[PDB]
Write a protein that binds this ligand. Structure first.
Ligand SMILES: Nc1ncnc2c1ncn2[C@@H]1O[C@H](COP(=O)(O)OP(=O)(O)OP(=O)(O)O)[C@@H](O)[C@H]1O
Ligand SMILES: O=C(NOC[C@H](O)CO)c1oc2ccncc2c1Nc1ccc(I)cc1F
Ligand SMILES: [Mg+2]
Length: 289
């Protein structure tokens, strides 16, 4: 069935970010609860049809590790993307409530991200372009899924920041980037979620004892490109996890691990095996089920 603006009704607001908002909505004809992302684009009527045409590939993006698509359309100023509502929210929200995410749980997340990126690359020849805790969504059935990935080339162009960057040194320095950049972002997201705050600048010894002003824009970006990369602190995390993120966070993109290598890394092989009630933990920590 085709989706159209007058067929919806706002239930609540799921949040916002550097531009458009997302509503939890009810599609009246179907009865389905959905997440409707609205993106404001003062943009000519020709190229906004291309965007919709290009977003139709999302109907073929079916994976347990990728947020489901219902449809896309242009309303009155705004292009609407309608997706699966994920009742656990994004990992940036669960981090706020959780304080930290345990390593075992990050093992399950790492698995999901790797397998999602792999799906998008192998089956659709696309890079994410925007991996970070807020674009990894989770639900009470224990699923972990990626969203907000770069399907439509046009949409990427029509949007082209914030105060915290998950961009890789190479992408920060110019156009010379591609799929290896998603690895960096994943690695940084993981350190963030393990430690409970954005890992740049790194915490001093005294701030690490406590766990176990904000930087200016240029200061921070300079740190990412010119200063050694962030590390998981020693002692409180397994050596294999430490290696995992170190392999993700190698400044040189060719030297950096790729998805094939990460898939067979000791930390994944260990997390594959482990028995973890992610569904249970998630609800327990945010108060749902
Ligand atoms: N499908 C969904 N189900 C449930 N919540 C969602 C869904 N999509 C987005 N959200 C929520 O909406 C919020 C805003 O999302 P949006 O993608 O507009 O920005 P963001 O990714 O949070 O931050 P940024 O602006 O840096 O991308 C997210 O933080 C997330 O909590
Ligand atoms: O939402 C995106 N960025 O977040 C920016 C924030 O809202 C800030 O304003 C975004 O960027 C793209 C670029 C190209 N193609 C698609 C998208 C796309 N959305 C998208 C992709 C897959 C699925 I499942 C659902 C989606 F909502
Ligand atoms: Mg987002």
């Amino acid at each position: 069935m085709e989706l159209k603006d007058d067929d919806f009704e706002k239930i609540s607001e799921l949040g916002a970010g550097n531009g458009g908002v997302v509503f939890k909505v009810s599609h009246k004809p179907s009865g389905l609860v959905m997440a409707r992302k609205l993106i404001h684009l003062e943009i000519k009527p020709a190229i906004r049809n291309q965007i919709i045409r290009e977003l139709q590939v999302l109907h073929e993006c079916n994976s347990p590790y990728i947020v489901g698509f219902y449809g896309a359309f242009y309303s009155d100023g705004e292009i609407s993307i309608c997706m699966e509502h994920m009742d656990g929210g994004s990992l940036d929200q669960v981090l706020k409530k959780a304080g930290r995410i345990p390593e075992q749980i990050l093992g399950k997340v790492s698995i999901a991200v790797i397998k999602g990126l792999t799906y998008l690359r192998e089956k659709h020849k696309i890079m994410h372009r925007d991996v970070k805790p807020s674009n990894i969504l989770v639900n009470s059935r224990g699923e972990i899924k990626l969203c907000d990935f770069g399907v439509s080339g046009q949409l990427i162009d029509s949007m082209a920041v914030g105060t915290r960057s998950y961009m890789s040194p190479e992408r920060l320095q110019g156009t010379h980037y591609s799929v290896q950049s998603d690895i960096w972002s994943m690695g940084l997201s993981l350190v963030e979620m393990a430690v409970g705050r954005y890992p740049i600048p790194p915490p001093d010894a005294k701030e690490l004892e406590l766990m176990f002003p904000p930087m200016a824009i240029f200061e921070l970006l300079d740190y990412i490109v010119n200063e050694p990369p962030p590390k998981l602190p020693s002692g409180v995390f397994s050596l294999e996890f430490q290696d995992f993120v170190n392999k993700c966070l190698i400044k040189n993109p060719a030297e950096r691990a790729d998805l094939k290598q990460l898939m067979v890394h000791a930390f994944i092989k260990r997390s594959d095996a482990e028995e973890v009630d992610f569904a249970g933990w998630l609800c327990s920590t945010i108060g749902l089920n």
